[PDB]
Amino acid sequence: SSKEELAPKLESIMSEISVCEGLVLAKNNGDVLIGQTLTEMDHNSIAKSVSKMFKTKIDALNKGNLLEMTLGMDEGFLIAVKNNDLMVLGFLGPDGRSSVGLLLRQLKNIMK
Amino acid sequence: EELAPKLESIMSEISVCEGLVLAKNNGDVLIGQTLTEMDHNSIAKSVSKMFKTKIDALNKGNLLEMTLGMDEGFLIAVKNNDLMVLGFLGPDGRSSVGLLLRQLKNIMK
Numbered sequence: 001s002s003k004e005e006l007a008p009k010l011e012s013i014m015s016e017i018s019v020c021e022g023l024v025l026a027k028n029n030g031d032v033l034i035g036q037t038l039t040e041m042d043h044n045s046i047a048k049s050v051s052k053m054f055k056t057k058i059d060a061l062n063k064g065n066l067l068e069m070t071l072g073m074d075e076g077f078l079i080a081v082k083n084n085d086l087m088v089l090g091f092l093g094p095d096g097r098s099s100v101g102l103l104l105r106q107l108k109n110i111m112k
Numbered sequence: 113e114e115l116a117p118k119l120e121s122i123m124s125e126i127s128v129c130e131g132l133v134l135a136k137n138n139g140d141v142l143i144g145q146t147l148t149e150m151d152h153n154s155i156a157k158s159v160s161k162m163f164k165t166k167i168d169a170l171n172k173g174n175l176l177e178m179t180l181g182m183d184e185g186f187l188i189a190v191k192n193n194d195l196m197v198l199g200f201l202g203p204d205g206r207s208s209v210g211l212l213l214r215q216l217k218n219i220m221k
Contacts, residue, residue, distance in 0.1 A: 045169035055163050061200070062155035064183025076171025091170070101210070 003033050003036055003088060009090070015105070019099050021076070021091040021104045028054065028087055033064065038090070049109060050080050068108065081107040113146050118144055121211040126212055128205035130185070135160065137191055146214050147210070159198055179213060190216045 003025070010023040012103040014036055022037030030051030035043040054066050071078040077100055088111055090103050118133045120170055123145060131146030139160035144152030180187040186201040186209055197220055199212050 005114040039171075041168040041171070046167065049165060049167045049169070050126055053162060053165050054172065058158040058180075058182075058187065059153060060158070061182070061187065062150075063185050063187070063200075066182055068181035070177075070179040071167075071175055072177030072179075073167075073170065073175055076168070076172045078170060078172070092173075 006086075006088075007034055010034070013090075013103070013106050013110075015097055017103055018095060019096050021093055022089075023091075023107075025091040026051070026087055026089070028082055032093060033086070041091075046078075047087075047089060050078070052086065053081070053086065054082055064071065068104065070104060076077060078105060079104045081111045083111045085089060115219060119143065119145055122199070122212070122215050122219075126205075126208050126215075128201055128208050129212060130200040130202055131198075132200075135196050135198070137163065137194065137196050139196075142195070155197065156196070157186070160196065163189070163191055163196065177213070177217070179209060188213050188216060190220045192220050195220065 005104040006025055014023055015018055023042055024035040024043050025033045026047040032043045032047045049071050056066060069080045076088055076094045079088055079090045081088055090107055092099055115134055123129055131135045133152045133156055134142040135156035137160060139157035141152045141156050151172055155217040176191060178189045183201050190197055197216050201208060
C-alpha cells in the first residue's frame with residue numbers, strides 16, 4: 001500500500017529535518033492517509049484546504065496544472081507536492097526558510 | 113510610479129522571467145508587463161482568490177507568499193496590506209525562483 005511504502009520515507013525526512021513540524025500524506029481529494037506532526041493539528045481540515053488550492057484553475061496563465069506549492073505564512077511555511085494520486089504536505093516553523101528548498105526537494109523525490 | 117521602473121529592472125535582470133503583474137489585493141491590475149499577450153486581470157483575480165484561502169487549521173496566521181510549480185513553469189506571488197505582485201517563469205527558470213521571490217519580497221517592503 002502507499003501508506004506502507006511512504007511511511008518510512010516520511011519518518012526519515014522528519015528525523016533528518018529536525019525543524020520539520022509535520023508531514024501529512026493525503027489522497028488528492030484531501031482524504032488523509034497517514035500523518036506525523038510535532039504538535040496537535042487538525043490534519044483533515046488542512047489537507048481539505050490544500051486539496052482545494054491544488055484545484056485552482058489559473059487558465060489565463062496556460063501553464064497547466066498545479067503540482068507543487070510553497071506557502072509562506074505569518075508563522076512558517078507549508079510545502080505541498082502532488083502526483084497524479086497522492087499529495088504530501090510538510091510544515092516548517094517561522095525560522096525554517098533555510099530548509100524550505102531542502103524539504104521541497106525531498107518531497108518531490110519521494111513523490112516523483 | 114515608484115514600482116514601474118522596478119518591474120522593468122527585474123525583467124531586464126532575469127531573462128527567464130516571462131512577466132510581472134502588480135495588482136491590488138482584490139485583483140485589480142495596476143501594471144502588467146508580459147513577454148506574450150496574457151489576460152493579466154484574469155490571472156490576478158485567480159491569484160487574489162487563492163490568497164483568500166482559509167487555512168487557519170495550520171495555526172500559522174495569514175498567507176503572505178506563494179511559489180506555485182506548474183506543468184509549464186512557475187508563478188510567484190507576494191502580498192502586503194495593499195498590493196500583490198506576481199511573477200511568471202518558464203520551466204527553464206527554476207534556478208531563478210529564489211532570486212525572483214527575493215526581488216518581489218524586496219519591492220513589496
